[PDB]
UniProtKB/Swiss-Prot annotation, chain A:
Cellular compartments annotated: Mitochondrion inner membrane
The protein's assembly and partners: Complex I is composed of 45 different subunits.
Gene that encodes it: NDUFB5
Entire-sequence positions represented here: 51 to 118 of 189
Family, as annotated: Belongs to the complex I NDUFB5 subunit family.
UniProt source species: Bos taurus
Protein name: NADH dehydrogenase [ubiquinone] 1 beta subcomplex subunit 5, mitochondrial
Signal peptide (from-to): none
Superkingdom assignment: Eukaryota
Reported function: Accessory subunit of the mitochondrial membrane respiratory chain NADH dehydrogenase (Complex I), that is believed not to be involved in catalysis. Complex I functions in the transfer of electrons from NADH to the respiratory chain. The immediate electron acceptor for the enzyme is believed to be ubiquinone.
Parts of the chain that traverse the membrane: 23-43
From Swiss-Prot, chain C:
Full-protein residues shown: 29 to 169 of 186
Membrane topology qualifier: Single-pass membrane protein
GO terms, biological process: mitochondrial electron transport, NADH to ubiquinone
Protein name, entry field: NADH dehydrogenase [ubiquinone] 1 beta subcomplex subunit 8, mitochondrial
Domain of life: Eukaryota
Compartment(s): Mitochondrion inner membrane
Curated annotation (Swiss-Prot), chain F:
GO cellular component, one term: mitochondrial inner membrane
PTM-bearing positions, type N-formylmethionine: M1
Gene that this polypeptide is encoded by: MT-ND4
EC number per UniProt: 7.1.1.2
Role according to the record: Core subunit of the mitochondrial membrane respiratory chain NADH dehydrogenase (Complex I) which catalyzes electron transfer from NADH through the respiratory chain, using ubiquinone as an electron acceptor. Essential for the catalytic activity and assembly of complex I.
Main location: mitochondrion
Organism of this sequence: Bos taurus
Coiled coil, from the record: none
UniProt-recorded name of the protein: NADH-ubiquinone oxidoreductase chain 4
InterPro entries cross-referenced by the UniProt entry: NADH4_N, NADH_Q_OxRdtase_chainM/4, NADH_UbQ_OxRdtase, ND/Mrp_TM
Curated annotation (Swiss-Prot), chain H:
Assembly and binders: Complex I is composed of 45 different subunits.
InterPro entries: NADH_UbQ_OxRdtase_NDUFB4_su (IPR009866)
Protein's name in the database: NADH dehydrogenase [ubiquinone] 1 beta subcomplex subunit 4
Pfam families registered for this protein in UniProt: NDUF_B4
């Protein structure tokens, strides 16, 4: 009835884009996402105290954190 | 198109919906009723009056 | 790849009629008062022969002005003279050269003296002399 | 450059290869996989170590006799101090 | 501008700045003939210097009495919400870059477009070359013969003839 | 260390050795990988800085600055691709080689362990850059940019080698920065000014003062296709950091004459940004930004008293990106329309809608909205340089005004209706247009989350 | 969105022009040629567009005054301005 | 104030022989639209007034320059001048502020920053 | 409610951003007395505002993104009120100053629209230059910017650090000399200026100074320039209001002169009684504008005060919204802000006041009548005048739903907010005669001179278009020359010299 | 938690209830409500892992250095012996920053802990605080050499001025 014709230059090359981010940026995001929670669930930083550790403690890995 | 639901005016002064104005007018009370308690009970100033400090003695 | 004689050369004059218009028609007849003259105060290399300057000022005015486009949108073929201040400038106002603002901005400057006084309400002025006494004057008790 | 091919970089194939070789190498393996690295990367500029040790040592002096934040010039009468 | 019609551009605006001064709708209307009286006071006399004092002194008494913030007729050379809608502006010839699967929509419309072009595909051989016949040397305002003598296709096609609408 | 120079020189025959057109994707693929190695052993200390070899401490220094240098390489081949596809492969094999041949020294420099490897490698460029400017120019004015780019850079950097060979045999050995543990001062004479003046002015002629910048827009206005080496020459300039290695020491105690370098560049900072407003050529318009809030570091460095180095470091890599990326926009929009004249392109923002938010986030980081690095790199400048004398708040407070009218006028010039005559400009920014324009704003703003990785030692 | 047609513009223009007591409402409407009702040189052509602006209200361009000979000509192009009938 | 700007002046009838001031322009808008209307163009127009707008402005001065008139030796009043001034302002400070930092203590003891 | 029982305000320590030499900046929030009350209000209006736009913008294809642009605005304007870390105040300070550009700049083209942006971001950036001065001064002296610490450890000389603040006050509070920006800040969409000018963006200029109350109570220099400033803002706005022809414009100056009373109240030391004003006021002018929507749109448009007509033609409800609010702003006889404008000139008016503002301010109170009655009498009073075919329909579920909430949440508001407070100060409460209704005393004849002059403007004996008067009045005449000058004396002088004129020579 | 004497705070002083009144209080319909929609999804999960976390216990130690190196060691021109005499001095300038941090936050606990008085209470922090920083920038702050940090070369040449001037040239002392 009363009607017109919308005009837009292109939506396709923009929609064909944003995917290659949003698709890929997750693709290694989500696998990197579990390892930031699961790896912390069963494994966490503890504790203190002290220690003399006999002769000398280990090398680096004095840190308090899962991956640090 | 969309619909005819109201036609325009050639300056025949279009009609109202008849629930348009009454539903509004009940909010002409809320200024005229809520103005009730102004003078009841409060005066132009509720103060107390300075009694001209005459005792300079 | 315009080949020869792209822009202005060593003016202001060599044959004022040779320039406008050989190409670059600023004037039609070589005197429109658009002749590539306006090298006012030379020796400044600024604006050589230049099918160009002092053509008048205050705006392209951007209105109906509709042979085709004629001002700031639609780009008539070649008039260009001076520009780039023209998108932040317009024409004649209603009044002319009245600074009454420096008057009004100084209108309060009258009340600078109203600053040196105070506004203390109680008591009134009551012309006095030595009645003032902001705090105390005579003995305490 | 559109004979109604879609295209990104150049031509038929490796263009399609050339998009996955930028997007995937470019980020999700670096702007993400790498960004993870420094996120929780170990104590930077030995400040983590400092908080506690500039914590413990406060009260040690405050407990027995000692003042706090001396600046006594590192044990004078270790220095002969040339006068003239 | 020919000396004859020079009062019109004043006669157009004269009452124009008036109405923005008056308030009541009759006020404009009541002063109409009353201020209309002054025009024909000398109705028929010389075109030159004799009546040029109807042009000469018209300058003052107009500019004097000017700028009571006139009514601007909103969509117009100036004033609010005139050029307002540019967020469409109808960029005609948006139909080029698509990558179909965006072209599935409006199939009847894509059919119609390529039918318009045939005119502009070849209308030229007599369209352009007639302008080499039409204007002998330095011709002023440049439109073709109004018909183009048989069928104009458009001729001004299509930039002025298909140009952009307003919504 | 060799962890780096060796693969990046190993790159060199990863390219020609390949086949036909596979070349671009071949090297762009690997060239990204090295970035894992880039961080790999780096971002160690921190305190008591890293030196892993005799003549290299790669970067310890808290001037990390090297990670960027390894970014911009496989941002070029995404950048440079446009019109370089139109000549021969054995030449296209060259332009990728010399471009690497640059990238190899910028890893050598910034480490250098010393003064005298710096210099010969500080002058070791200009062989690779000069060859990219003169060939593959556009206009014919390029031939003069070839000379002007020398005859300054080289003009006064010879007085270095007269001075640095004068120190080597005067006090001990300059062989190592990490031993300054004996340094006597410089009191005064009519000889020592020159020493201080010889050990300085060579650096100024790179990061411009308001004098002797006469070359900077000459080379950038007319310069290779993509900004292909114009992205690199916005790395080269800021790399005059080495003044941070000297003026910290090695004549510490002459501030006596500092003032002609303060009031000369401090009134130019309010200046050359203002001669940038009426420019009619766009790649000029950006070239004068690059002077301005770069030349602010020269009043950050000369003043001692950190909170400047807190803020002076963030700036070298502040516009290191923003000022990079703008040359990437003005390139693209030039592919389609072949004038660099700013006026001509108008009536965009309808026809390329996605590239709207690209201009904005660029022109917004000269405005320096508070959260990003930019201000947190400027507001450690103002905090110390205020204490110098209270009056610096005015001029450099004006800088924060004219720069805002400066940026917008570049965007808002591309919001207008223009349909006008262009039948060109069809391409709706094929991915590379928006891919290489990213990998800037994503990594840039990001750092604000943990912005202790850009800071000096102080 | 407001519906517009070509009838009202033949009516409205017919309407107020038939409202003025200076014109008898037996006179021609669509074509009078207006030169019979042009009297005089002024106070007609610019006079008649003084009112017709009061209803639609776009600007009534100057150079479009000389199109006003034909009473079908005025209504003719007002269709082309406001995007009127198909 | 800026300016009259002369919206009326003398005229009438002299300089009515001045015509073809429009013939100058009318030629072009005929030719320009003769340019601007064509089916196959797809590209910008030369527009020489712009070519002669920049190129007679940016370049083409130091070529035209001569170091002669002492209104072109003016710039010493402009370029160098205030640059000496800013030295005169500062060098007094940074000293007046310094002398007090030695004899007498202006600051407080809770200022560690700096 | 949790606060209006036990007090107990809070902050938060959360998340350490970089820690440099000594001062350690992380982030926080502030629950303080300005946080507890205001924030519910600024959300409560904006609760009702989007519905209006939801009808107004209903046909715009980009609507989806509009509410995005309008959303961040509320977000970041909301972090200004809540932050106790002085830097953090500056994140949202400029976060909003950019949002103006991206809204006023809604319509492209329209050579005025996008040049109303370049105004907004020009004048704020000057008004920026101050607040980075008092950001510097605290370090070199106090070695922190924390709003807690300054107030615990008091500065002696605030003279320089504070005057900087009074300058950034005037940038966003639309004071005099920076004012020309508002009247041209209206060129965008209507619900924009509803949001921009009511409870937000114009409040920060006089908001920020309030937060500084504990330190600013001393040092008469501070107090002095304030009331020697804000009072003057009024009568240059008032004297520029009259004769102006647009619905939107007059409603722009109305809020321009609402400021002069606020900033005065900082001048005399009245920290809280200043801020209660905005809490109340904001309920007005959102309604007042949002009322005019159905007037502008459903009339297909005018937004001229000419061609309006009378009170009742199918506008029964909206015209009741005007005459309630547009009455309320007139000095609050029993209504909402009865505790706002009314408790000022009756309290701080007993003080050391300059004995000019008393003359000056109370005169501005008069024009508060003719502000209203003018745009009432041309729109709601005279005979209908406007072209035929007017389609007006006010039956609009997505509109009537919006007004009804405010006016209800209007009348009761002023008393609820005020009735519940811990009292923070001592008002004089002994107010002698002739100091008492002296505001109301003026408005009483305002309405007199409103209607008598209205009829004397229109209904009078035909006082002719007599060409001779002085109008420096309807223009303001400052926007005439300067904006013809500042882009001359600078752009074309210190550039065209500095340009290729020199660098190439 | 933390170390008590590292972060001392005054005790709680819980306020007494004062119902006094016959009217309903809504908080008791919330603190009795809100508690029941919180504890279940919240406290059960923290207890859930904290036992789930009983399966493994790591270690990270308390790093304490070995101090032989002194300030008067050793040679004038020397490198080896004066490489370390900063490592003593550099860490001990990273400490004395933070001890200003800790003492500063303790100050804030003098205010919003109280904030009404702000004056007649705390007895300590402020009157102490400006006796702390005045023990800071003197001799522990190399200024304006702070850019170079001038470690141990200028560190003792303030403190030569703090010797070769004070205590002798003081005239007469
Ligand atoms: C990051 C910072 C976000 C906040 C600032 C941006 C404001 C939102 C915005 O982009 O407005 C675009 C809008 C575009 O206007 P337009 O030219 O008419 O639109 C043309 C096209 O439609 C193209 O313009 P557009 O409006 O359609 O924008 C494209 C957008 C539109 O669709 C949306 O989703 C709206 C995006 C708004 C929020 C974006 C994410 C917020 C986090 O589509 C997308 O968002 C793509 C998905 C991206 C997801 C990213 C996820 C993290 C990476 O306005 C602007 O150009 C200026 C934006 C800057 C506002 C001021 C910023 C400082 C304050
Ligand atoms: C101008 C030329 C004038 C230079 C004066 C001579 C330089 C000089 O004598 O150096 C001073 C000193 C070395 O000489 P001496 O004092 O004997 O050292 C003591 C050794 N026991 O100490 C030094 O070694 C300084 C030597 C390096 C100075 C070389 C650079 C001096 C001039 C640099 C100009 C800066 C840029 C100007 C040139 C660019 C334009 C062409």
């Amino acid at each position: 009835g009363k009607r017109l014709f919308i005009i837009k230059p292109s939506g396709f090359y923009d929609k064909r884009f944003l995917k290659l981010l949003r698709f890929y940026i997750l693709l290694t995001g989500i696998p990197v996402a579990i390892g930031i929670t699961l790896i912390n669930v069963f494994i966490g930083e503890a504790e203190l105290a002290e220690i003399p550790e006999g002769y000398v403690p280990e090398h680096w890995e004095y840190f308090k954190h899962p991956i640090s | 198109g969309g619909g005819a639901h109201i036609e325009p005016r050639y300056r025949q002064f279009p009609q109202l919906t008849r629930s348009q104005v009454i539903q509004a007018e009940f909010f002409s009370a809320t200024m005229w009723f809520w103005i009730l308690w102004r003078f009841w009970h409060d005066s132009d100033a509720v103060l107390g009056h300075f009694p001209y400090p005459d005792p300079s003695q | 790849a315009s080949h020869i004689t792209k822009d202005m050369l060593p003016g202001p004059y060599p044959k004022t009629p040779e320039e406008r218009a050989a190409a670059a028609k600023k004037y039609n007849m070589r005197v429109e008062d658009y002749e590539p003259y306006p090298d006012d105060g030379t020796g400044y290399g600024d604006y050589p022969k230049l099918p160009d300057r002092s053509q008048q000022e205050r705006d392209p005015w951007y209105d109906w002005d509709h042979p085709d486009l004629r001002l700031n949108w639609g780009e008539p073929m070649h008039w260009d003279l001076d520009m780039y201040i023209r998108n932040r400038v317009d024409t004649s106002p209603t009044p002319v050269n009245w600074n009454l603002m420096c008057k009004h901005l100084f209108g309060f400057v009258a009340f600078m003296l109203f600053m040196f006084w105070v506004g203390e309400t109680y008591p009134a002025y009551q012309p006095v002399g030595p009645k003032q006494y902001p705090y105390n004057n005579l003995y305490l008790e | 450059k559109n004979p109604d091919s879609h295209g990104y970089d150049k031509d038929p194939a490796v263009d399609i290869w050339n998009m996955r070789v930028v997007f995937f190498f470019g980020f999700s393996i670096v702007l993400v996989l790498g960004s993870t690295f420094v996120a929780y990367l170990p104590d930077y500029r030995m400040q983590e170590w400092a908080r506690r040790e500039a914590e413990r040592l406060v009260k040690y002096r405050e407990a027995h006799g000692l003042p706090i934040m001396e600046s006594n010039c590192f044990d004078p009468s270790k220095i002969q101090l040339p006068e003239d | 501008l020919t000396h004859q019609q020079k009062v019109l551009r004043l006669y157009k605006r004269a009452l124009r700045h008036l109405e923005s001064w008056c308030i009541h709708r009759d006020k404009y209307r009541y002063f109409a003939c009353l201020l209309r009286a002054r025009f024909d006071e000398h109705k028929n006399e010389k075109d030159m210097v004799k009546a040029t004092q109807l042009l000469r002194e018209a300058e003052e008494e107009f500019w004097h009495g000017q700028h009571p913030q006139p009514y601007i007729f909103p969509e117009s050379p100036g004033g609010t919400s005139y050029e307002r809608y540019e967020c469409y502006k109808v960029p005609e010839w948006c139909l080029d870059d698509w990558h179909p699967s965006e072209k599935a929509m409006y199939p009847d419309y894509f059919a119609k477009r390529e039918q318009w072009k045939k005119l502009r595909r070849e209308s030229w051989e007599r369209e352009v070359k007639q302008l080499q016949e039409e204007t002998p040397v330095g011709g002023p305002r440049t439109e073709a013969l109004p018909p183009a003598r048989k069928q104009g296709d458009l001729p001004p096609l299509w930039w002025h003839i298909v140009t952009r609408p307003r919504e | 260390m060799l962890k780096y120079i060796i693969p990046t020189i190993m790159l060199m025959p990863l390219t020609w050795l390949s086949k036909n057109n596979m070349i671009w994707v071949n090297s762009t693929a690997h060239s990204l990988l090295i970035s894992f190695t880039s961080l790999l052993l780096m971002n160690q200390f921190g305190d008591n800085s890293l030196n892993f070899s005799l003549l290299f401490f790669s970067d310890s220094l808290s001037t990390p600055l090297l990670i960027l240098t390894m970014w911009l390489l496989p941002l070029m081949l995404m950048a440079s691709q446009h019109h370089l596809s139109k000549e021969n492969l054995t030449r296209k094999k060259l332009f990728i080689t010399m471009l690497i041949s640059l990238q190899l020294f910028l890893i050598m420099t910034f480490t250098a362990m010393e003064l005298i490897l710096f210099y010969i490698l500080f002058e070791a460029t200009l062989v690779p850059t000069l060859i990219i400017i003169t060939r593959w120019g556009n206009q014919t004015e390029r031939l003069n940019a070839g000379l002007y780019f020398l005859f300054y850079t080289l003009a006064g950097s010879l007085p270095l080698l007269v001075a640095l060979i004068y120190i080597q045999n005067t006090v001990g050995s300059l062989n190592f920065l990490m031993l300054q543990y004996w340094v006597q001062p410089v009191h005064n004479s009519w000889s020592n000014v020159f020493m201080w003046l010889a050990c300085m002015m060579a650096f100024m002629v790179k990061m411009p003062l308001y004098g002797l910048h006469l070359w900077l827009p000459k080379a950038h206005v007319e310069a290779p296709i993509a900004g292909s080496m114009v992205l690199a020459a916005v790395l080269l300039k800021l790399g005059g950091y080495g003044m941070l290695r000297i003026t910290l020491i090695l004549n510490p105690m002459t501030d006596f004459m500092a003032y002609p370098f303060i009031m000369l560049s401090l009134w130019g900072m309010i200046m050359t940004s203002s001669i940038c407003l009426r420019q009619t050529d766009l790649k000029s318009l950006i070239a004068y930004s690059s002077v301005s809030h770069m030349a602010l570091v020269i009043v950050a460095i000369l003043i001692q008293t950190p909170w400047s180095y807190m803020g002076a470091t963030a700036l070298m890599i502040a516009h290191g990106l923003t000022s990079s990326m703008l040359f990437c926009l003005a390139n693209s929009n030039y592919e389609r329309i072949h004038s660099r004249t700013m006026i001509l392109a108008r009536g965009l923002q309808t026809l390329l809608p996605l590239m709207a938010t690209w201009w904005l986030l660029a022109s917004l980081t000269n405005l320096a909205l508070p959260p990003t690095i930019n201000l947190i790199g400027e507001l450690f400048v103002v905090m110390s340089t205020f204490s110098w004398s209270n009056i610096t708040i005015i001029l450099m407070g004006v800088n924060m005004v004219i720069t805002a009218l400066y940026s917008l006028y570049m965007l808002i010039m591309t919001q207008r209706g223009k349909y006008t005559y262009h039948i060109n400009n069809i391409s709706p920014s094929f991915t590379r247009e928006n891919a290489l324009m990213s990998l800037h704003i994503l990594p840039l703003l990001l750092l604000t989350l943990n912005p202790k990785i850009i800071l000096g030692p102080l | 969105a407001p519906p517009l047609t070509l009838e009202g513009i033949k009516d409205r223009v017919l309407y107020v022009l038939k409202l003025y007591d200076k014109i008898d409402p037996e006179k021609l409407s669509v074509n009078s040629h207006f030169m019979k009702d042009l009297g005089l040189d002024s106070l007609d052509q610019v006079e008649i567009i003084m009112a017709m602006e009061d209803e639609f209200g776009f600007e009534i361009p100057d150079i479009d005054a000389e199109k006003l000979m034909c009473p079908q000509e005025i209504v003719d192009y007002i269709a082309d301005k406001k995007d009127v009938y198909e | 104030t800026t300016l009259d700007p002369a919206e009326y002046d003398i005229s009438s009838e002299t300089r009515k022989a001045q015509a073809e001031r429009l013939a100058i322009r009318s030629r072009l808008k005929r030719e320009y639209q003769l340019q601007y209307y064509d089916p196959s163009r797809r590209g910008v127009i030369e527009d020489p007034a712009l070519v002669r707008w920049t190129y007679a402005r940016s370049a083409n001065i130091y070529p035209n320059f001569r170091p002669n008139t002492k209104t072109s030796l003016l710039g010493a009043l402009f370029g160098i001048g205030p640059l000496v001034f800013w030295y005169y302002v500062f060098k007094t400070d940074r000293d007046r502020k310094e002398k007090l930092i030695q004899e007498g203590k202006l600051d407080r003891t809770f200022n560690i920053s700096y | 409610m949790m606060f209006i029982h036990s007090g107990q305000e809070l902050i938060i320590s959360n998340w350490h951003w970089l820690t440099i030499q000594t001062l350690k900046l992380s982030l926080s929030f502030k629950m303080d007395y300005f946080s507890m009350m205001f924030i519910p209000v600024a959300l409560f209006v904006t609760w009702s505002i989007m519905e209006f736009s939801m009808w107004y913008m209903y046909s715009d294809p980009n609507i989806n993104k509009f509410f995005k642009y309008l959303l961040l605005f509320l977000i970041t304007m909301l972090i200004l009120v809540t932050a106790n870390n002085l830097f953090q105040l500056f994140i949202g300070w400029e976060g909003v100053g950019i949002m103006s550009f991206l809204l006023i700049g809604w319509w492209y083209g329209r050579a005025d629209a996008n040049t109303a942006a370049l105004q907004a971001i020009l004048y704020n950036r000057i008004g920026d230059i101050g607040f980075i001065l008092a950001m510097a001064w605290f370090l070199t002296n106090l070695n922190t910017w924390d709003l807690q610490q300054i107030f615990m450890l008091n500065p002696s000389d605030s003279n320089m650090p504070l005057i900087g603040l009074a300058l950034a006050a005037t940038g966003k509070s639309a004071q005099f000399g920076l004012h020309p920006w508002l009247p041209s800040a209206m060129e965008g969409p209507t619900p924009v200026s509803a949001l921009l000018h009511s409870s937000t963006m114009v409040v920060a200029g006089i908001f920020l100074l309030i937060r500084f109350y504990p330190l600013t109570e001393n040092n008469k220099y501070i107090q002095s320039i304030t009331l020697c400033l804000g009072a003057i803002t009024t009568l240059f706005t008032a004297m520029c209001a009259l004769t102006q022809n647009d619905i939107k414009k007059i409603i722009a100056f109305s809020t321009s002169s609402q400021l002069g009373l606020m900033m005065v109240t900082i001048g005399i030391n009245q920290p809280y009684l200043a801020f209660l004003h905005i809490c109340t006021h904001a309920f007005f002018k959102a309604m007042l504008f949002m009322c005019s929507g159905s007037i502008i749109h459903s009339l297909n448009d005018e937004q001229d005060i000419r061609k309006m007509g009378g009170l009742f033609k199918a506008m029964p409800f909206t015209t009741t919204a005007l005459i309630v609010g547009s009455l309320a702003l007139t000095g609050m006889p029993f209504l909402t802000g009865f505790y706002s404008k009314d408790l000022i000139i009756e309290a701080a008016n007993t003080s050391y006041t300059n004995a000019w503002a008393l003359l000056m301010t109370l005169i501005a109170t008069s024009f508060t009548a003719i502000y209203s009655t003018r745009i009432i009498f041309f729109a709601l009073l005279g005979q209908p005048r406007f072209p035929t075919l007017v389609n007006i329909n006010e039956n609009n579920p997505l509109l009537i739903n919006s007004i009804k909430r405010l006016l209800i949440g209007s009348l009761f508001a002023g008393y609820i907010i005020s009735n519940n407070i811990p009292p923070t100060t001592i008002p004089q409460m002994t107010m002698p005669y002739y100091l008492k209704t002296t505001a109301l005393i003026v408005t009483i004849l305002g309405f007199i001179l409103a209607l008598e002059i209205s009829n004397m403007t229109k209904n009078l004996k035909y006082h002719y278009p007599s060409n001779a008067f002085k109008f420096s009045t309807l223009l303001g005449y400052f926007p005439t020359i300067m904006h013809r000058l500042a882009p001359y004396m600078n752009l074309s002088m210190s550039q065209k010299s500095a340009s290729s004129l020199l660098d190439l020579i | 938690s933390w170390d008590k004497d590292v972060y001392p705070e005054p005790p709680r002083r819980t306020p007494a209830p004062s119902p006094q009144t016959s009217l309903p209080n809504p908080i008791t319909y919330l603190t009795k409500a809100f508690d029941l929609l919180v504890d279940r999804p919240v406290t059960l999960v923290r207890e859930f892992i904290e036992r789930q976390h009983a399966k493994n216990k790591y270690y990270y130690y308390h790093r304490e250095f070995r101090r032989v190196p002194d300030i008067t060691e050793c040679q004038e021109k020397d490198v080896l012996c004066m490489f370390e005499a900063e490592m003593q001095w550099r860490r001990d300038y990273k400490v004395d920053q933070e001890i200003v941090n800790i003492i500063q936050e303790r100050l804030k606990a003098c205010q919003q802990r109280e904030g009404e008085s702000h004056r007649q209470n705390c007895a300590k922090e402020l009157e102490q605080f400006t006796q702390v920083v005045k023990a800071y920038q003197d001799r522990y702050h190399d200024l304006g050499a702070h850019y170079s940090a001038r470690k141990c070369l200028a560190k003792q040449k303030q403190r030569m001025l703090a010797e070769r001037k004070a205590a002798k040239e003081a005239a007469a002392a």
